[PDB]
Design a protein around this ligand. Structure first.
Ligand SMILES: *[C@@H]1O[C@H](CO)[C@@H](O)[C@H](O)[C@H]1NC(C)=O
Ligand SMILES: *[C@@H]1O[C@H](CO)[C@@H](O)[C@H](O)[C@H]1NC(C)=O
Ligand SMILES: *[C@@H]1O[C@H](CO)[C@@H](O)[C@H](O)[C@H]1NC(C)=O
Ligand SMILES: *[C@@H]1O[C@H](CO)[C@@H](O)[C@H](O)[C@H]1NC(C)=O
Ligand SMILES: *[C@@H]1O[C@H](CO)[C@@H](O)[C@H](O)[C@H]1NC(C)=O
Lengths: 73, 319, 229
């Protein structure tokens, strides 16, 4: 399977029309992954979950609980 | 204005130093692991610049959107929010920054000089910028430290006034004046970038230095370095293999070291851009995703809040 | 406090599991060590290259060529070996500058994240920074950034101020929220509703200059003492 990326010709990876988090970075917004009989797919990067914050001129969101998260660096 | 990314160049000795010269090729492999090292050095830079962009802009894993009706108590973000009309989903300021930064890269590309495209193409870099903008207006300083909690933008600004020791009543009485000052200041930024082009010199110099180093790396193949000639098929067509061996070797060591210097300059340049990208990432974390008390960090004055803007190979903060 | 301690202990245990499940969690350290060995390996492997001379071994050149006739071959290896060593030193200087920048960042994080509590957003981990705990790691340091992440939001109808007696009341600290019918004042970062008093709010002029104000009662704390009298 032949796909034409702006980074070059990609052979062996089918070009799906979906969008996922970048698994293997190809370039020019295209990232490849191993997903569904499973194959290697080449998609456009999904920058994140599409969500609009319910903004309003008289609406505020205030947390009621919390999480003490210990990240590592 | 802060440089963030650099042109992801990638050399190939076995075509740069000499193309269609097998005798030079095995002479190269006699030198050893110089060139697997250089491709390693430059792919290390190229991954680094992909990671520079990925850490300045991808501070959010959620892509936020401003409400379709854009009222914010009088603040006019139309000059920084992306245009739904233009094909490129960039703000007029983003558009202005792009038109103020200037095929020539393909020229060096012809000479064994690949220019890998950045992983985050400029339209998705603009999406991060739009996401950071939409989060900063709708949520404020909160979406960068957990969930996106909506808040009236004037209420958020009133809090940011409280952050600088000015009680929020000052805003609510002067909200119309603040909004008018805010919109006027944004408009002046548009004019300032339009009128004064050198404004983006910090970005243009980076691009210029990239081309200059690439330009120099191409002008070196036109130097015989003390050999009979600079062209290799010339030396191979008018000298014997055991005789041209010395002249071929002279061009190899000369071209190889010129490659060594450019890689060294790129490593210096990548380190400088790494420092600027880390500074840009820090400013995005503190100036944009929050409200920093660090004096003169996020602009001259008491920092209220900031706006990122994607620019070619860099980011522009409106403090 | 009990919930916070339980969340803290669970988060620390998750850090142990995350580092255990993910060995690559330390790629930033392993890469540095790998880079060092690779440069050292490259520096050793150059001595197996003759750099245009007859052979890489020097005893070989000196045992089968004459001293003034092996002079040029000796020099070729000297140039190549010293240029290879020049490259390695330059790479180490590049990489030492990178590590120095990372070490300065680590020292800064230790000064601010550990020895204090930094308001710098996303500096000491993602969220509102509480504290940090350093950990010695091979040729590096691992910070455990204990951060306060708000979790369960709730939409409230808010208001910039409260016009009680023809004069605007603004929250002394926090925001005004309403559960739909009653108005409360609460902290910005945690829903803790409080009755709007004159102690939770200050006053600034009349109540027709702020836009978005809503008429509501501001409960004066000492008025019930008037009723007691
Ligand atoms: C309130 O928040 C929820 C969850 O984010 C959202 O789905 C809902 O539409 C919001 N409603 C209003 C009126 O803001
Ligand atoms: C901002 O002002 C411009 C005119 O300069 C206008 O076209 C646009 O609709 C305004 N947008 C907002 C959000 O007020
Ligand atoms: C609002 O909250 C109060 C408790 O502080 C409660 O008594 C009242 O019934 C609530 N009204 C609503 C549902 O808005
Ligand atoms: C916000 O806008 C609505 C109209 O959409 C208006 O009815 C309401 O009173 C306003 N509240 C404020 C100013 O917070
Ligand atoms: C509050 O009272 C005023 C009169 O003092 C009235 O004009 C207004 O509509 C009322 N509503 C508000 C501002 O909450």
């Amino acid at each position: 399977n032949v796909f034409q990326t702006r980074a070059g010709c990609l052979i062996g990876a089918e070009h799906v029309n979906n969008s996922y988090e970048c698994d293997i970075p190809i370039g020019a917004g295209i990232c490849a992954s191993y997903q569904t009989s499973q194959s290697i797919i080449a998609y456009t990067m999904s920058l994140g979950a599409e969500n609009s914050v319910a903004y309003s001129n008289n609406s505020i969101a205030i947390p009621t609980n919390f999480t003490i998260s210990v990240t590592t660096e | 204005i802060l440089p963030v990314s650099m042109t992801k160049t990638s050399v190939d000795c076995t075509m740069y130093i000499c193309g269609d010269s097998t005798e030079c090729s095995n002479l190269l492999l006699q030198y050893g692991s110089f060139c697997t090292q250089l491709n390693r050095a430059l792919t290390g830079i190229a991954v680094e610049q992909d990671k520079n962009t990925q850490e300045v802009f991808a501070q959010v894993k959620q892509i936020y959107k401003t409400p379709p009706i854009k009222d914010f108590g009088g603040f006019n973000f139309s000059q920084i929010l992306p245009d739904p009309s233009k094909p490129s989903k960039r703000s007029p300021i983003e558009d202005l920054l792009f038109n103020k930064v200037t095929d020539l890269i393909c020229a060096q590309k012809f000479n064994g000089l690949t220019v890998l495209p950045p992983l985050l193409t400029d339209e998705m870099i603009a999406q991060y910028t739009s996401a950071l903008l939409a989060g900063t207006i709708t949520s404020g300083w909160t979406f960068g430290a957990g969930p996106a909690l909506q808040i009236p933008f004037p209420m958020q600004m009133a809090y940011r006034f409280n952050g600088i020791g000015v009680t929020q009543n000052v805003l609510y009485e002067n909200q119309k004046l603040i909004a008018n000052q805010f919109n006027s200041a944004i408009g002046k930024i548009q004019d300032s970038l339009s009128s004064t082009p050198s404004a983006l010199g910090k970005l243009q110099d980076v691009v210029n230095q990239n081309a200059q180093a690439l330009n120099t790396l191409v002008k070196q193949l036109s130097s015989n370095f003390g050999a009979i000639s600079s062209v290799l098929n010339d030396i191979l067509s008018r000298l014997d293999p055991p005789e041209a061996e010395v002249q071929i070797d002279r061009l190899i060591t000369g071209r190889l070291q010129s490659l060594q210097t450019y890689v060294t300059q790129q490593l210096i340049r990548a380190a400088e851009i790494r420092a600027s990208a880390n500074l840009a990432a820090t400013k995005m974390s503190e100036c944009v995703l929050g409200q920093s008390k660090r004096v003169d960090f996020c602009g001259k004055g008491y920092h209220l809040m900031s706006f990122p803007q994607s620019a070619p190979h860099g980011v522009v903060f409106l403090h | 406090q009990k919930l916070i301690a339980n969340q803290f202990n669970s988060a620390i245990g998750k850090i142990q599991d995350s580092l255990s499940s993910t060995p690559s969690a330390l790629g930033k350290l392993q890469d540095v060590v790998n880079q060092n060995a690779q440069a050292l390996n490259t520096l050793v492997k150059q001595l197996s290259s003759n750099f245009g001379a007859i052979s890489s071994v020097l005893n070989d050149i000196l045992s089968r060529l004459d001293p003034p006739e092996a002079e040029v071959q000796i020099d070729r290896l000297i140039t190549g070996r010293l240029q290879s060593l020049q490259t390695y030193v330059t790479q180490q200087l590049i990489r030492a500058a990178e590590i120095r920048a990372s070490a300065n960042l680590a020292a800064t994080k230790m000064s601010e994240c550990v020895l204090g509590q930094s308001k710098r957003v996303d500096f000491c981990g993602k969220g509102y920074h509480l504290m940090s705990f350093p950990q010695s790691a091979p040729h590096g340091v691992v910070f455990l950034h204990v951060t306060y992440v708000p979790a369960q939001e709730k939409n409230f109808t808010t208001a910039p101020a409260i016009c009680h007696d023809g004069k605007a009341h603004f929250p002394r600290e926090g925001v005004f929220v309403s559960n739909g019918t009653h108005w409360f004042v609460t902290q910005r970062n945690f829903y803790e509703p409080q009755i709007i008093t004159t102690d939770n709010t200050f006053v600034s002029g009349n109540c027709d200059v702020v836009i978005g104000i809503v008429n509501n009662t501001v409960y004066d704390p000492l008025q019930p003492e008037l009723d007691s009298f």
